């Protein structure tokens, strides 16, 4: 079809568009064809400190990917809204409205001047939601066999795959580095992950994660930095998700985790 949306861009815009998108979990499973359709529909939108890019309750129009600038996340608790987190010069938001045809479930506002790459909902539903149909096949059984995910309404566990993204790693490849700031949760799908620990300089092995085992969740809960490095042992495939997604769907897991986290 030629009813596709296309926003002509300069070589520079595409370059930046490219950097901004390299790590967006929602694009991880798209073939080159699907990705280029997406990129063509991306439009640039500048923002200013204080600007309410999204207001809770509003209608879902676009999906956003951050090019730069800081942001704050706000939710209303009984009528009072609080900063429940934030984004820092990278990440994506505004997908829930388009995926589930529901009102914006939060408020996003620039906490400094920024820029964004938006994606209309027609394109988003046409390609990303289609993409989720594929991901569900591939990982529905698997995800539904992960013990730590028993504590979730049958319905909640369904929306999990909708926001995970597949990351491939070669042998010897670093997945996360101890110390670094954390913005993602991992779940080994295939291969093996070696977890090691070091000391203040420039390495003791402390665990091995196999298909079905998660890691990188400690720093998300303790709101602390990476407490250990992770490396791929041979080809590894992890099903990942950002913290916002983590806290949004995994709250019902923090217990069985916080407890089993004592085993650290
Ligand atoms: C820190 C996680 C906070 N939680 C969970 C609390 C209920 C969130 N709960 C719901 N939506 C969130 C959350 N965080 C970011 N968004 C993003 O803010 C967006 C607002 O538009 P949306 O509902 O279409 O999609 C949303 C998400 O990408
Ligand atoms: C049973 C070994 C327990 N220990 C060693 C005790 C000091 C651990 N101590 C600290 N982190 C561990 C440990 N095991 C796995 N991780 C995982 O390795 C991850 C490193 O990133 P993270 O800190 O965000 O979350 C971590 C855990 O999922």
Swiss-Prot record:
Keywords, ordered alphabetically: cAMP, cAMP-binding, Cell membrane, Cytoplasm, Membrane, Nucleotide-binding, Phosphoprotein, Repeat
Residues reported in the UniProt entry to bind 3',5'-cyclic AMP 1: 26-147
Entry superkingdom: Eukaryota
Binding site for 3',5'-cyclic AMP 2: 148-264
Record flagged with keyword Cytoplasm: yes
One of the protein's GO biological processes: learning
A single cellular component GO annotation: dendritic spine
Subcellular location(s) of the protein: Cytoplasm; Cell membrane
Keyword Cell membrane: yes
PTM entry text: Phosphorylated by the activated catalytic chain.
GO molecular function: cAMP binding; cAMP-dependent protein kinase inhibitor activity; cAMP-dependent protein kinase regulator activity; protein domain specific binding; protein kinase A catalytic subunit binding; protein kinase binding; ubiquitin protein ligase binding
Tissues expressing the protein: Four types of regulatory chains are found: I-alpha, I-beta, II-alpha, and II-beta. Their expression varies among tissues and is in some cases constitutive and in others inducible. Brain. Present in a few pyramidal neurons and mostly in mossy fibers. Colocalizes with PJA2 in dentate granule cells and at postsynaptic sites of primary hippocampal neurons.
Similarity comment: Belongs to the cAMP-dependent kinase regulatory chain family.
Subunit structure: The inactive form of the enzyme is composed of two regulatory chains and two catalytic chains. Activation by cAMP produces two active catalytic monomers and a regulatory dimer that binds four cAMP molecules. Interacts with PRKACA and PRKACB. Interacts with the phosphorylated form of PJA2. Forms a complex composed of PRKAR2B, GSK3B and GSKIP through GSKIP interaction; facilitates PKA-induced phosphorylation and regulates GSK3B activity.
Protein task: Regulatory subunit of the cAMP-dependent protein kinases involved in cAMP signaling in cells. Type II regulatory chains mediate membrane association by binding to anchoring proteins, including the MAP2 kinase.
Protein's name according to its UniProt entry: cAMP-dependent protein kinase type II-beta regulatory subunit
Native organism: Rattus norvegicus
């Amino acid at each position: 079809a030629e009813s596709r949306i296309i926003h002509p861009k300069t070589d520079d815009q595409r370059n930046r568009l490219q950097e901004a998108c390299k790590d967006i979990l929602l694009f991880k499973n798209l073939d080159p064809e699907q990705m280029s359709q997406v990129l063509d529909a991306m439009f640039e939108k500048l923002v200013k400190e204080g600007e309410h890019v999204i207001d809770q309750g509003d209608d879902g129009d676009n999906f956003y990917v951050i090019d730069r600038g800081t942001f704050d996340i706000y939710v209303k608790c009984d009528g009072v809204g609080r900063c429940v987190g934030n984004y820092d010069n990278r990440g994506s938001f505004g997908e829930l409205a388009l995926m589930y045809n529901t009102p914006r479930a939060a408020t996003i506002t620039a906490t400094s001047p920024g820029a964004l790459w938006g994606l209309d909902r027609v394109t988003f539903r046409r390609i990303i939601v289609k993409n989720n149909a594929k991901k569900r096949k591939m990982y529905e059984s698997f995800i539904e066999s992960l013990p730590f995910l028993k504590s979730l309404e049958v319905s909640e566990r369904l929306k999990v795959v909708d926001v995970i993204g597949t990351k491939v790693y070669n042998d010897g490849e670093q997945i996360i580095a101890q110390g670094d700031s954390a913005d993602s949760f991992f779940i080994v799908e295939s291969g093996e992950v070696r977890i090691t620990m070091k000391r203040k300089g420039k390495a003791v092995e402390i665990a091995r994660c196999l298909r079905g085992q998660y890691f990188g969740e400690l720093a998300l809960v303790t709101n602390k930095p990476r407490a250990a490095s992770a490396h791929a042992i041979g080809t590894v495939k992890c099903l990942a998700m950002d913290v916002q997604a983590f806290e949004r769907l995994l709250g019902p897991c923090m217990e069985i985790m916080k407890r089993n986290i004592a085993t650290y």
